[PDB]
Design a protein around this ligand. Structure first.
Ligand SMILES: CN(C)CCC[C@@]1(c2ccc(F)cc2)OCc2cc(C#N)ccc21
Ligand SMILES: [Cl-]
Length: 548
């Protein structure tokens, strides 16, 4: 049972809300197949080494994202930045679960609300295919999602978000209460019910793929998926999106991996964990893209519109597609219930992990918080509840888009780049390899060390620079955000990006001694500060820097 339980755990942890909800619309927005080349390249080159490095760090040091930097005290700022990024993401990661809960609640009927027009929320322009460069938006499913769930028609933009919707308010309240009561007692919350949540997503994806392949218009969608438009690979939007989606789905850059590995056994095999998780994530992403493109090709055939204009490119793509695929099934009510229960469970577990990252990171830093986990959990959950209250308004989709674009974009890329640079160069790739050997029994191969030291940081810096200089103003379908919205988004990104130099400056000023003494104390492990007085620093010799 050692291997079967491990396989269940790894397959459960290998699929996130990202793979199911965010990958579809990022793949649709980027042409389809053309998005998989950057995705797979980045996956290997950066994602696999960074996943492995974070797991090894957490396992060896037994600390959260913040306090794990006792090895290189100057990067506690990086730790704080990743914790803040996780906190930001949790603001809308819960609104998505609220949407899923609302859909599940509305799915308990023999006549699904997303099948035809004729309801209170339908506009006079609603078009029913059975009864008779834009994105359409006049279909029963799109009309339902945008009017009877979001009530987006009552807001003119991000300047007129309006008051919170009370149905989504109740759903968010339920989600937050469940999260708190699942986090308040301790980290140990697995091995009890995750069995169903680890297999259900794969079953749902399998059934959807099998059913969608046999649809009238699925062939065109599959052709559009397997057709690669190489012109799109010279714009850098696809590359930025692929990198960000990778660091989202894999879980790196949020401090989740370090916090969760801090509870692993000292002899746990992180290399096999990273390899298996990366392979599963790649296969799942490819299958999900295939099924999504099949579904939207079927819809394009159904609605007599081009595949590029059939559906939205925003965060509601799954809530438009999956109900439309369910409506084509027999006993569609049961399938809808099953799918949305799956989505609820997956989102709940993912948000639970994201919030546990923050809780552990802050509790390891301050012992008072670690002594009062109940109050700290309540405070974190209440803050998330309010800042997600901000995202359930009538124009809440615009705020959600702004967050999903800015909270972890260049910010998460920069945080991961700083993590990699810090460890590999200042702490030492040789030291990290020695630690991994002492931990798991074998030294990492040359490929891993090269990826950690040279390849991954270079690509991360390149993508960060390109995202900064090649920045497209924010938009949501046909709505162009005003400039101050972009300024606010860049301020949000900087809020977590700037914690690195700020903490470096604070650490330098707070330390006592000469400039060289300050540097030595800053770039030396906290448990080896007794060598600073002996003027024996490895970082001050060229051998340390040229070591690979
Ligand atoms: C952006 N989000 C927040 C990242 C979440 C990462 C994740 C995680 C933690 C440790 C790992 F080794 C691997 C993945 O946290 C828990 C979890 C649960 C599921 C489920 N079902 C899926 C992923 C995770
Ligand atoms: Cl993904």
């Amino acid at each position: 049972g050692k291997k079967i339980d491990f396989l269940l755990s790894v397959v459960g942890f290998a699929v996130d809300l990202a793979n199911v909800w965010r990958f579809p619309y990022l793949c649709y927005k980027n042409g389809g197949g053309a998005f998989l080349i950057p995705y797979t390249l980045f996956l290997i080159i950066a994602g696999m080494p960074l996943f492995y490095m974070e797991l090894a760090l957490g396992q060896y040091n037994r600390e959260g994202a913040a306090t794990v930097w006792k090895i290189c005290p100057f990067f506690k700022g990086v730790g704080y930045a990743v914790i803040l990024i996780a906190l930001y993401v949790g603001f809308y990661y819960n609104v998505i679960i609220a949407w899923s809960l609302y859909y599940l609640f509305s799915s308990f009927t023999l006549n699904l609300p997303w099948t035809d027009c004729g309801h209170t929320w339908n506009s006079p322009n609603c078009t029913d295919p059975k009864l008779l460069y834009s994105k359409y938006k006049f279909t029963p499913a799109a009309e339902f999602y945008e009017r009877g769930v979001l009530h987006l028609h009552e807001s003119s933009g991000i300047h007129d978000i309006g008051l919170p919707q009370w149905q989504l308010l109740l759903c968010l309240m339920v989600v937050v209460i469940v999260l708190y009561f699942s986090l308040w007692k301790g980290v140990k919350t697995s091995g009890k019910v995750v069995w169903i949540t680890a297999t259900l997503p794969y079953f749902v994806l399998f059934v959807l793929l099998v059913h969608g392949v046999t649809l009238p218009g699925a062939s065109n969608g599959i052709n559009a998926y397997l057709h690669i438009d190489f012109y799109r690979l010279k714009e850098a939007t696809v590359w930025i999106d692929a990198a960000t989606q990778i660091f989202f789905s894999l879980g790196a850059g949020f401090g989740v991996l370090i916090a969760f590995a801090s509870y692993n056994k000292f002899d746990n095999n992180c290399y096999r964990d990273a390899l298996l998780t990366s392979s599963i994530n790649c296969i799942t992403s490819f299958v999900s893209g295939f099924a999504i493109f099949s579904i939207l090709g079927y819809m394009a055939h159904e609605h007599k519109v081009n595949i590029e204009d059939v559906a939205t490119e925003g965060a509601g793509l799954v809530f438009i597609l999956y109900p439309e695929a369910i409506s084509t099934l027999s006993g569609s009510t049961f399938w809808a219930v099953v799918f949305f229960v799956m989505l609820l469970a997956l989102g709940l577990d993912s948000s639970m992990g994201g919030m546990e990252a923050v809780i552990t990171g802050l509790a390891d830093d301050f012992q008072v918080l670690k002594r009062h986990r109940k109050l700290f959990t309540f405070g974190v959950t209440f803050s998330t509840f309010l800042l997600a209250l901000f995202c359930i308004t009538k124009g809440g989709i615009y705020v959600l888009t702004l967050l999903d674009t800015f909270a972890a974009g260049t910010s998460i890329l920069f945080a991961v780049l700083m993590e990699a640079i810090g460890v590999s160069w200042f702490y030492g790739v040789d030291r990290f390899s020695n630690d991994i050997q002492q931990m798991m029994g074998f030294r990492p191969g040359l490929y891993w060390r090269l990826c950690w030291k040279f390849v991954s940081p270079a690509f991360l810096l390149f993508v960060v620079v390109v995202s900064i200089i090649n920045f497209k103003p924010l938009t949501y379908d046909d709505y162009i955000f005003p400039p101050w919205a972009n300024w606010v988004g860049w301020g949000i990104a900087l809020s977590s990006m700037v914690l690195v130099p700020i903490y470096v400056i604070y650490k330098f000023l707070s330390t006592q001694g000469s400039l060289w003494e300050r540097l030595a104390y800053g770039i030396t492990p906290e448990n080896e500060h007794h060598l600073v007085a002996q003027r024996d620093i490895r970082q001050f010799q060229l051998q340390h820097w040229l070591a690979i």
